[PDB]
Amino acid sequence: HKILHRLLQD
Amino acid sequence: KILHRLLQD
Amino acid sequence: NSLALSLTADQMVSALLDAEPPILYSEYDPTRPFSEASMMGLLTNLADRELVHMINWAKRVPGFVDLTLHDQVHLLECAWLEILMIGLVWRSMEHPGKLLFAPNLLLDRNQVEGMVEIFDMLLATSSRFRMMNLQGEEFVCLKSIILLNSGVYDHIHRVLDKITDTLIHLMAKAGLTLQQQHQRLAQLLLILSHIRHMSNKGMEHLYSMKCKNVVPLSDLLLEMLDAHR
Amino acid sequence: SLALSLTADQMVSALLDAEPPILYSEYDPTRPFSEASMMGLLTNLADRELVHMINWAKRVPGFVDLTLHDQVHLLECAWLEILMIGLVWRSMEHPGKLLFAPNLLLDRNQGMVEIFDMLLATSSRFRMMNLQGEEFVCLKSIILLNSGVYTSLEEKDHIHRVLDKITDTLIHLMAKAGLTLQQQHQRLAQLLLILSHIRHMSNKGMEHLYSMKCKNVVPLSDLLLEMLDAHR
Ligand SMILES: C=CCCn1nc(-c2ccc(O)cc2O)c2cccc(C(F)(F)F)c21
Numbered sequence: 001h002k003i004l005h006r007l008l009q010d
Numbered sequence: 011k012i013l014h015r016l017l018q019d
Numbered sequence: 020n021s022l023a024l025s026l027t028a029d030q031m032v033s034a035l036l037d038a039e040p041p042i043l044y045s046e047y048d049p050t051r052p053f054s055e056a057s058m059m060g061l062l063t064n065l066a067d068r069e070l071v072h073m074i075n076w077a078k079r080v081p082g083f084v085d086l087t088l089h090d091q092v093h094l095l096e097c098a099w100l101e102i103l104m105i106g107l108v109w110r111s112m113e114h115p116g117k118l119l120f121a122p123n124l125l126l127d128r129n130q131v132e133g134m135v136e137i138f139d140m141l142l143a144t145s146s147r148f149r150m151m152n153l154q155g156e157e158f159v160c161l162k163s164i165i166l167l168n169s170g171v172y173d174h175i176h177r178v179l180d181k182i183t184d185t186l187i188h189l190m191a192k193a194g195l196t197l198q199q200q201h202q203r204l205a206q207l208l209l210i211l212s213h214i215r216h217m218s219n220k221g222m223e224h225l226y227s228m229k230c231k232n233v234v235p236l237s238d239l240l241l242e243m244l245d246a247h248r
Numbered sequence: 249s250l251a252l253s254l255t256a257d258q259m260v261s262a263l264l265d266a267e268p269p270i271l272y273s274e275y276d277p278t279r280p281f282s283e284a285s286m287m288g289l290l291t292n293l294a295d296r297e298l299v300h301m302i303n304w305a306k307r308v309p310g311f312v313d314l315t316l317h318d319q320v321h322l323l324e325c326a327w328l329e330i331l332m333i334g335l336v337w338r339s340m341e342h343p344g345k346l347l348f349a350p351n352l353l354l355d356r357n358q359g360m361v362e363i364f365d366m367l368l369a370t371s372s373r374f375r376m377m378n379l380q381g382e383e384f385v386c387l388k389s390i391i392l393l394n395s396g397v398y399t400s401l402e403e404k405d406h407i408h409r410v411l412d413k414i415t416d417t418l419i420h421l422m423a424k425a426g427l428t429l430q431q432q433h434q435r436l437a438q439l440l441l442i443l444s445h446i447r448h449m450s451n452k453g454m455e456h457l458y459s460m461k462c463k464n465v466v467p468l469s470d471l472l473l474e475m476l477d478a479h480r
């Protein structure tokens with residue numbers, strides 16, 4: 001689970 | 011070096 | 020159908036200009052970094068904070084939103100350093116011989132071990148941009164091209180074409196002749212090959228920094244690094 | 249100079265006439281190959297191609313106007329990119345496969361695999377664009393002149409002048425093929441963006457080459473070793 005995944009969602 | 015002389019001739 | 024394709028050249032330019040991330044500052048403290056730990060510490064910290072802004076910028080680049088989350092992740096993982104670098108050389112144009120990482124962080128070549136090579140490449144790129152009189156509108160086009168192109172391995176190609184139209188649009192608007200237009204287009208796009216080169220070299224250096232484990236690296240910067248491996 | 253006086257058509261003619269030959273590998277279907285020997289075929293082939301590339305480079309308009317030191321630098325920077333674009337060019341008509349030699353056609357299986365897929369994607373790109381031989385030779389000359397241009401000051405200016413002339417030749421070819429102005433600009437950009445990926449593939453290849461050196465199992469020619477040394 002990449003931080004980039006989270007940031008691209010918010 | 012090699013490349014140099016190959017280019018020179 | 021993507022909205023990006025329906026945008027006019029001026030709409031595209033306005034969208035890109037309005038999406039521009041802010042120019043961030045480094046730590047205050049006029050201590051000139053002349054060491055590995057200090058300099059790289061400032062650069063990674065800066066890169067860390069810029070990454071957050073870059074992610075929000077990318078989402079505002081027309082066509083990027085139309086991609087799946089996984090595709091967006093891929094493009095950013097491939098292009099992030101290229102994007103930071105082109106921004107750097109853009110800010111450094113008016114500072115010949117120097118690199119303006121931040122308004123309060125101006126470095127010259129006299130400052131780290133194997134790093135000078137990349138430093139000189141960045142300087143040469145900035146100088147090249149300066150002599151070409153690169154315009155802000157052109158810069159933003161090039162930056163979006165890097166985002167969409169670097170990891171592009173039909174929608175993106177379509178979008179990339181529109182940006183090309185936009186670049187030509189700007190040049191014609193600036194009064195350039197037809198030959199001057201395609202020549203300048205070629206010149207700008209060829210520089211992207213060198214930015215790619217610098218990115219790959221910088222990534223190898225970032226990797227050494229990791230394995231030497233002296234400079235603190237954020238988890239984000241580490242995951243971006245791992246992606247390249 | 250001499251490259252600055254050429255017409256677009258004369259430029260294309262010269263480049264076509266300067267094309268190097270397609271060499272064979274030492275591949276033998278009866279001989280069992282280990283991962284090392286497989287790479288041996290590719291390194292052996294590259295070494296023999298280099299001699300032909302060096303002589304092709306001399307025939308690239310404007311190249312001989314440079315100092316021997318600058319000619320050396322350009323080739324040291326571009327050699328793998330040039331080999332790669334040559335590969336993807338002759339692989340165009342072989343979808344899902346790379347034609348390293350007339351006697352060495354490989355797909356991703358048997359085929360390091362990441363670079364392989366990138367070369368496949370590049371060849372696939374050229375095929376859809378229906379890249380013309382005239383365009384290919386222009387692109388290859390651009391790589392030679394551009395890859396090391398940013399690594400006196402009059403030399404680079406001359407280099408940039410010649411590069412501009414090749415752009416004029418590319419546009420000339422596209423206009424000749426019936427493309428509207430918009431289509432010309434778009435195709436020009438499309439071709440040049442591919443050079444960014446070719447640079448990337450070369451960068452990755454240079455790293456693998458270094459790895460092969462350190463493992464000391466795949467034979468590397470003296471020239472190849474000197475090429476690698478310059479790179480780092
Ligand atoms: C002369 C060496 C440059 C390498 N480099 N440059 C950055 C960087 C940071 C912020 C920015 O706005 C623009 C930039 O180019 C950078 C960040 C992390 C690691 C490296 C290095 F290549 F040194 F590992 C960086």
Ligand SMILES: C=CCCn1nc(-c2ccc(O)cc2O)c2cccc(C(F)(F)F)c21
Pocket residue numbers: 290291293294297331332334335348359360363364367452453454456457
């Ligand atoms: C499966 C791709 C590996 C990369 N690669 N490709 C060549 C090569 C040789 C001859 C030719 O006409 C075209 C080519 O692309 C090559 C040569 C030396 C080293 C590598 C390496 F795998 F190390 F990147 C090469």
